[PDB]
Amino acid sequence: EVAALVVDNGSGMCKAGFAGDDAPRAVFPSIVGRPRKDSYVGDEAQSKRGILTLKYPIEHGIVTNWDDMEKIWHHTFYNELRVAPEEHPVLLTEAPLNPKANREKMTQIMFETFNTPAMYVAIQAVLSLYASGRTTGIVLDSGDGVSHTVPIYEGYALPHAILRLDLAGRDLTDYLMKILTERGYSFTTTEEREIVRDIKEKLCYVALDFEQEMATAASSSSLEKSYELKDGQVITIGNERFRCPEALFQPSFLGMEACGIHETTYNSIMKCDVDIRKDLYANTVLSGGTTMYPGIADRMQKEITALAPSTMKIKIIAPPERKYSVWIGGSILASLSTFQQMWISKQEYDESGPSIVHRKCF
Numbered sequence: 001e002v003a004a005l006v007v008d009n010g011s012g013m014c015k016a017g018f019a020g021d022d023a024p025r026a027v028f029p030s031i032v033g034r035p036r037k038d039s040y041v042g043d044e045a046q047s048k049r050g051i052l053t054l055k056y057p058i059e060h061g062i063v064t065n066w067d068d069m070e071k072i073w074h075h076t077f078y079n080e081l082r083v084a085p086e087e088h089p090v091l092l093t094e095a096p097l098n099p100k101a102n103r104e105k106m107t108q109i110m111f112e113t114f115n116t117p118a119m120y121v122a123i124q125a126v127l128s129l130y131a132s133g134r135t136t137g138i139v140l141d142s143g144d145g146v147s148h149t150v151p152i153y154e155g156y157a158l159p160h161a162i163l164r165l166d167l168a169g170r171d172l173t174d175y176l177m178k179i180l181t182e183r184g185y186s187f188t189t190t191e192e193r194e195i196v197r198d199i200k201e202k203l204c205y206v207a208l209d210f211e212q213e214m215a216t217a218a219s220s221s222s223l224e225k226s227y228e229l230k231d232g233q234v235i236t237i238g239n240e241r242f243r244c245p246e247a248l249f250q251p252s253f254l255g256m257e258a259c260g261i262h263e264t265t266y267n268s269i270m271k272c273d274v275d276i277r278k279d280l281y282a283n284t285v286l287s288g289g290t291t292m293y294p295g296i297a298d299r300m301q302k303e304i305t306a307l308a309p310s311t312m313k314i315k316i317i318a319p320p321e322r323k324y325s326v327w328i329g330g331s332i333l334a335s336l337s338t339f340q341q342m343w344i345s346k347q348e349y350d351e352s353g354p355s356i357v358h359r360k361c362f
């Protein structure tokens with residue numbers, strides 16, 4: 001056979017490549033644009049913001065507009081990867097606990113619209129655990145539009161213990177824009193949002209102790225970092241560096257009543273059979289671009305520890321390439337001998353119909 005194609009659809013970015021590679025061949029923005037050709041996808045859809053009405057097909061992880069998603073996939077196949085989908089089995093990723101109806105539309109589009117010889121849909125968080133080389137653990141997947149905690153035991157996810165936190169990279173990006181603005185600068189436009197997203201990714205970090213970090217930055221300049229704008233203006237970022245990602249642990253800074261990532265992780269563990277909570281505590285795996293902040297692991301360690309029984313062994317695993325662990329796990333799974341029997345063949349589709357997805361996929 002040829003290569004399966006691994007397509008990781010995200011809320012902000014989409015990752016695509018060939019099973020067997022250790023990194024996705026292409027990564028582009030999850031946006032489609034039409035007149036305010038007929039449509040535009042990715043970076044070129046943004047540079048035409050003023051003349052195009054932009055839409056975001058994947059919000060908070062769920063596909064909300066199928067015509068748009070279909071265009072993202074068409075763009076992924078012909079423009080990005082430059083392959084014929086009918087000559088490749090396709091593995092798509094999806095968010096945990098998504099509408100059963102969605103899973104059927106994904107299958108249908110892949111077969112009836114792209115004529116894929118075979119496809120499959122897999123929960124992102126599970127792929128990340130596989131990427132870490134485990135079959136048991138609790139993954140904290142945090143991206144650009146949504147965050148989930150997914151307990152997995154012996155290779156299978158535990159639906160009833162999965163939680164969803166609507167706080168991720170996009171919220172943090174805007175929050176950084178707001179505090180720097182309060183600082184004396186002015187970041188409010190979509191063009192500027194792209195700039196603050198870059199600042200956030202390069203100079204932000206999670207303090208081990210908020211207050212102490214605040215005190216150190218209020219009486220010293222030791223934590224300050226300079227950032228240069230394209231036009232040459234140099235701006236300094238002080239406590240914003242850590243105050244921004246702090247919103248993950250304290251959503252209230254954003255007017256949100258939901259509990260932080262550490263507490264949400266703990267809550268997923270408690271929803272699990274007491275017999276496996278230990279395995280989960282010693283195997284808390286970070287995933288997604290938003291778990292990339294320097295210092296986040298040691299902070300998760302300290303916070304989880306404070307929540308769990310004193311006799312509990314805590315361990316936070318923060319893979320270096322966790323910004324793509326989902327896609328990678330997909331690359332790994334698609335090539336698994338034991339996984340081949342899971343693909344949904346076009347034959348299995350013609351006979352059983354779209355509903356075949358609930359049998360082999362879930």
Ligand SMILES: C=C1[C@@H](C)[C@H]2[C@H](Cc3ccccc3)NC(=O)[C@]23[C@H](OC(C)=O)/C=C/[C@@](C)(O)C(=O)[C@@H](C)C/C=C/[C@H]3[C@@H]1O
Nearest residue numbers: 121122123126127155156157158159338339342360361362
């Ligand atoms: C990557 C996924 C699948 C490959 C399954 C995977 C186990 C597996 C691996 C290789 C070959 C066969 C099965 N681990 C899971 O949680 C899956 C596996 O799905 C199947 C069909 O086993 C688990 C299913 C349940 C019932 O546990 C679910 O939680 C279900 C609601 C969501 C789907 C989970 C599946 C996940 O998307």
Ligand SMILES: Nc1ncnc2c1ncn2[C@@H]1O[C@H](COP(=O)(O)OP(=O)(O)OP(=O)(O)O)[C@@H](O)[C@H]1O
Nearest residue numbers: 010011012013143144145146169201288289290292
């Ligand atoms: N080094 C970094 N530090 C902090 N944040 C980062 C870093 N690198 C990337 N990010 C953020 O990670 C987010 C993108 O992560 P990812 O691609 O995993 O999410 P997604 O799949 O696009 O969306 P979601 O999974 O929520 O549906 C963006 O907010 C990006 O700015």
Ligand SMILES: [Ca+2]
Nearest residue numbers: 010011124143
């Ligand atoms: Ca994702």
Ligand SMILES: [Ca+2]
Nearest residue numbers: 250251252257
């Ligand atoms: Ca609070």
